[PDB]
Every structure is written in structure tokens, then in C-alpha cells.
């Protein structure tokens, strides 16, 4: 339990940190205007995992 | 003068976004997070 928490948490930061740099998530904010729940869902999903 | 020159300014905008990406996020979290706590003395004291 102690180590599993250390694993899942580290993975998500590795993903969200690299997800913003790529143009996929970058182009969203030039047109949509905001996240649209991407960060909210990501954080929400992390709890479920 | 016509093609390359404007692109240089265009690169700056796409090259400057990676910093504004996080400032609004961090401010929007703490600002919204702090608003969750009560403000009234009666309600706040009841929490204690």
C-alpha cells in the first residue's frame, strides 16, 4: 500500500508534465479557451485508480 | 519580408504559451481552494 501510492502518484506527474508540452494539449487553449475538465478528469481518475 | 518575417512573431506566441499554461492553473487552484473554507465567525467557530 505504501509503495503502490508512491508508484501511481509518480506516474501521473510524469504524464501530465509531458502532456502539456506536446502540441495536442497545447492547441486546445488557443481555441477552446480553458482545460474543459482535462485536468479535473485526470485528477479525478487518479483517485479511482 | 512577407513570409518569414511574420512567422518569427508567430513562433514567439507559440514559444511563450508554455509559461502561461501553468500560472493560471496554479492561481485558479489556490484561489478556488481557499474559497472552500467558511468565512462567517459563527460557521467558522462551529467548525472548531
Amino acid at each position: 500500500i505504501e509503495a503502490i501510492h508512491e508508484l501511481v502518484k509518480n506516474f501521473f506527474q510524469r504524464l501530465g508534465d509531458r502532456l502539456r508540452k506536446v502540441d495536442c494539449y497545447h492547441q486546445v487553449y488557443r481555441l477552446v479557451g480553458n482545460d474543459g475538465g482535462i485536468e479535473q478528469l485526470l485528477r479525478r481518475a487518479e483517485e479511482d485508480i | 519580408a512577407e513570409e518569414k518575417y511574420p512567422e518569427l512573431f508567430a513562433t514567439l506566441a507559440n514559444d511563450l504559451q508554455p509559461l502561461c499554461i501553468a500560472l493560471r492553473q496554479f492561481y485558479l487552484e489556490n484561489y478556488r481552494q481557499l474559497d472552500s473554507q467558511p468565512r462567517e465567525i459563527a460557521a467558522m467557530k462551529a467548525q472548531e
Binding site: 488557443r30 | 511574420p6 506566441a13
Partner: peptide, 21 residues
């Protein structure tokens, strides 16, 4: 101001902050 100046040549604009609620 940044978007206002860059608006003169390109449509690549950043995000505003409003109605945070």
C-alpha cells in the same frame, strides 16, 4: 496588452482570466 499588439499580425492569442467564481 500582449494579445492586443500581436493581434495586428497574427491570431495566436493566449488565455484570459474572468468569471473565476
Amino acid at each position: 496588452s500582449i494579445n492586443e499588439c500581436l493581434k495586428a499580425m497574427q491570431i495566436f492569442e493566449q488565455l484570459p482570466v474572468i468569471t473565476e467564481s
